[PDB]
């Protein structure tokens, strides 16, 4: 009765990766509610001077 | 490692510690043939192998 993770499928060849950056590890809420939204989400991506 | 296949490092993304290096008094000689030992913290580069 609960939600799980199995599928990460995101990468396939691990190849010789750079530097790698982690954070501290938590538990989002993943559960599908119907209905109207409650938030959005925003993220501005910029490349400039490396 | 051994030199028929040598172990390197990639120690990026984190902020250098050669004063420990220069003023140890544990190593036989430093004598390395790239930049002046001195003043090492000054500059800064991108990646260091080890
Ligand atoms: C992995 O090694 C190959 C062969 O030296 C190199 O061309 C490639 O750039 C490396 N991948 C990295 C450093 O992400």
Redo the contacts with the bound molecule.
């Keep these: 009765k609960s939600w799980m993770e199995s599928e990460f499928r995101v990468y396939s060849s691990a190849?010789?990766?750079?530097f790698e950056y982690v954070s501290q590890p938590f538990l989002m809420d993943l559960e599908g509610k119907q209905g109207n939204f409650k938030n959005l989400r925003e993220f501005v991506f910029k490349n400039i001077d490396g | 490692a051994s030199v028929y296949a040598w172990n390197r490092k990639r120690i990026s993304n984190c902020v250098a510690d050669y004063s420990v290096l220069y003023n140890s008094a544990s190593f036989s000689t430093f004598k390395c043939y790239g930049v002046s030992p001195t003043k090492l913290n000054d500059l800064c580069f991108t990646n260091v192998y080890a």
């Design positions: 190849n010789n990766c750079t």
